[PDB]
Amino acid sequence: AKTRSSRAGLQFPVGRVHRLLRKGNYSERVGAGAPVYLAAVLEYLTAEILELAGNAARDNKKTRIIPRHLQLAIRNDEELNKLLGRVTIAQGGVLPNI
Amino acid sequence: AKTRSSRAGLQFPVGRVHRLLRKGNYSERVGAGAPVYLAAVLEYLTAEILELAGNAARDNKKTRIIPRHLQLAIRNDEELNKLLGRVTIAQGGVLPNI
Amino acid sequence: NIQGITKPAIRRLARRGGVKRISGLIYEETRGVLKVFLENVIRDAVTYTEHAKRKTVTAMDVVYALKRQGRTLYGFGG
Amino acid sequence: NIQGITKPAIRRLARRGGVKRISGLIYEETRGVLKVFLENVIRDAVTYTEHAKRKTVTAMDVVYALKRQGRTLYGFGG
Amino acid sequence: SYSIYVYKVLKQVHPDTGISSKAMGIMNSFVNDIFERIAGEASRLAHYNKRSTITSREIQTAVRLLLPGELAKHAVSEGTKAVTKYTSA
Amino acid sequence: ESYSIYVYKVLKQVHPDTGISSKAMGIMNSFVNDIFERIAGEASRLAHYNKRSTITSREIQTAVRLLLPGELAKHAVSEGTKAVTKYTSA
Amino acid sequence: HRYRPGTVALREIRRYQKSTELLIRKLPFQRLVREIAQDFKTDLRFQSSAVMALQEACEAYLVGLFEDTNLCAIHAKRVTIMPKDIQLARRIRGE
Amino acid sequence: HRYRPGTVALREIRRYQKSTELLIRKLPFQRLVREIAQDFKTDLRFQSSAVMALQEACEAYLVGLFEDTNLCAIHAKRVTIMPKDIQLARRIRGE
DNA sequence: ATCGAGAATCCCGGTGCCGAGGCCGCTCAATTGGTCGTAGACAGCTCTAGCACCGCTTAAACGCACGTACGCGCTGTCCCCCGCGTTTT
DNA sequence: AAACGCGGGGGACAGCGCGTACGTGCGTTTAAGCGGTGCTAGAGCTGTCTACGACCAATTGAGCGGCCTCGGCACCGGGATTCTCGAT
């Protein structure tokens, strides 16, 4: 057995994403490439946020990412801030701004 | 043949509403009462707007409803204005307000 | 119970918002605004609870209510 | 082509908005704001056109673009 | 389109009042928009409760969540009356 | 079910010595679920608008262009295209 | 006879708030739409209704913005709208 | 020693903009939530996380509103926020 | 603040003309019975477990009182800029 | 629609009387913490049967034209409603 994730070189689950598309009342049929494409996009976005959040953790002399670090990474990036404009990060706080 | 609309005492099409629910990727199955309920709600909302728009037409000495009359009816009613807050009526104009 | 939102608490919220000076009439105004916001969210959350035939408002009910009012919250199961 | 949005046109839009007095720097500011708005809507409308493999932007493409930017338009097929 | 049904309803509330094609287009857009909002909320409710069927209960709850104040109260009355009449044919 | 295992795998690739709190993991899970819904919902609309019954990689790509801002879209499209190409060659 | 500054301005408000016609000239607006679209895709055609839909939305958006800009000016004890008023309105709106 | 009006206020801004903790006392907030919910349904129970979710959203909403209210005050050449600033912010936001 | 002349908007109106939705005819497609198959929504039913309650302790924050410095809202004055109109594209 | 001639409400800035809210300290609640219990409501399990769907024929409501006659657009009358400019 070879997972579709390993065939696509991804860490995100293609098989699970396929099932969620099929049972999510999105369309009658789902192409074979759609879950692969979606999984890769989700993985890319997670990597971007985690990389920026880990940098914020290191700047705070921390070795574990907390909601504060995620909020810092998202609000300090114009594109991530736009994507998550109407989103509230619990225990994220605000940017120091006077 | 007796239409489901006539069985429900409605002018709106229950059969068409049922098909639109079944082919709209909303759920796997649709109950028999769901289209009847939805059709009645759509009919009630249309009646409300049309009644208020016809009154606005009569106040403007007009015998035909135009987009202006619809805009007047919606913006002069707090509840209809809230429901259609993020909606633009083409050729509706604005409320006289200085 | 609305008086439990004390002046010091409202001041702290304003400080996080970057406010330096506050008028004395702001506290009552803020209490009114918070009441309206809470009523709107709780109303929808209770609607979800009643639809689930539950007697307990869940965090999910609140998350759904916030999502539909355009105030998506991350951290509570969605 | 942005200069085609003349000062009298901008004044008319302001009059419908209930504006009585207008500064001379408003005309250039308005032109910039309109350009940003148009770019955003046209970008999405063209994306819909390309997805349909069409060479003609339809009213539906515009309606869909407005709908997804939270500016639903009634009167043009949805 | 819903043009025929909008006209039928107009003749009931205003027998001597007509409607322009532009105004008819607005009404068609309105019905389609509200349909989508209600059906989409009903779809979410069913999924949230792990149900595969959208029933009159899901529609009623969606109406309460979307329609403001007395609009919801009267819409629920209309929907309930219609279902009752339909079940007794 | 949750995306916790996959978020951790990706974290260890971008930051091998960095861990994550349970609260931060919950934020990441909410984020993935939210973006999934946005993309799938837009792809669903695109298919319906074009009278199609199948959501394919083309619908996903178009949804990504409509939702992700600026270079986020550019890089996400590259990642998705690379993954589909690798998958089709197994 | 000379009307005092403000009298004709208020008369224009009354006239345009009563009318529903488009206030931007159609041909110049069409040229702007085509010029903007050229940067996204070349050789693009446009349905007549597509340009009309764009014009209706843009005018509605600008009228709505001018309403909020006016409130900002009045808030600063002014009767004249300035760029700072447009900027504040857009910032608060999230734009 | 007496700090001049404004010095301790700015120190508090720096402290609360650096922290992420909830600023409303939990027990009073819980009482308000239960009192408001009573008008919608009687004998309502609440998951502990449900009350926490409500508190996080309310605090975020009020902090965001105070940010826009501050901009309105500065726009009127004031450093003090007043009810008229809250009213303008909400009106422009569509609330 | 009130009262008239002098011009100068719009609003009402009788007259005329023309465009377009409304009743009508035709067509085709789909809504509604109809019967049968099946699948999940109800109804217990049973377990458990998660916060209402209480009780007590504790200590940290909320009110209040006061002192006192500081922005607020006129108030007035300078200068200066969009407007109204006119004339020409 | 664009450019030129005045021009006076209008915006912007200096003064200042004063409420008014920030800073600080003492006493009082009252919220946080900890511990223990209850039971009523959420979650898992099993039978079933009612309400869902599947295929399909039709004939009738509903959509595509189609002609047209009435209400909307227009045009000069003229009417009374608004705004400017002297005086009580």
Numbering used by the authors:
A (entry chain C), B (entry chain G): 14 to 111
C (entry chain F), D (entry chain B): 25 to 102
E (entry chain H): 36 to 124
F (entry chain D): 35 to 124
G (entry chain A), H (entry chain E): 39 to 133
What does the literature reporting this entry say, word for word?
We then obtained the cryo-EM structure of the OLTN, with an overall resolution of 7.6 Å. In the OLTN structure, another hexasome is associated with the OLDN, and consequently, the hexasome (proximal), hexasome (central), and octasome (distal) moieties are aligned in this order. A 3D map (8.5%) was obtained with a possibly different orientation between the OLDN part and the proximal hexasome portion, but this is uncertain due to the noisy background. In the OLTN structure, a 349 bp DNA segment is continuously wrapped in the hexasome–hexasome–octasome core and adopts a “slinky”-like shape. In the distal octasome part, 145 bp of DNA contact with the histone octamer, while in the proximal and central hexasomes, 97 bp of DNA directly bind to the histone surface. The hexasome–hexasome and hexasome–octasome boundaries are connected by 7 and 3 bp DNA segments, respectively. The H2A–H2B dimers are missing at the hexasome–hexasome and hexasome–octasome interfaces.
The nucleosome is a fundamental unit of chromatin in which about 150 base pairs of DNA are wrapped around a histone octamer. In this process, the nucleosome remodeling potentially induces the collision of neighboring nucleosomes and forms the overlapping di-nucleosome (OLDN), in which the hexameric nucleosome (hexasome) lacking one H2A–H2B dimer associates with the nucleosome (octasome). In the present study, our genome-wide analysis of human cells suggests another higher nucleosome stacking structure, the overlapping tri-nucleosome, which wraps about 300-350 base-pairs of DNA in the region downstream of certain transcription start sites of actively transcribed genes.
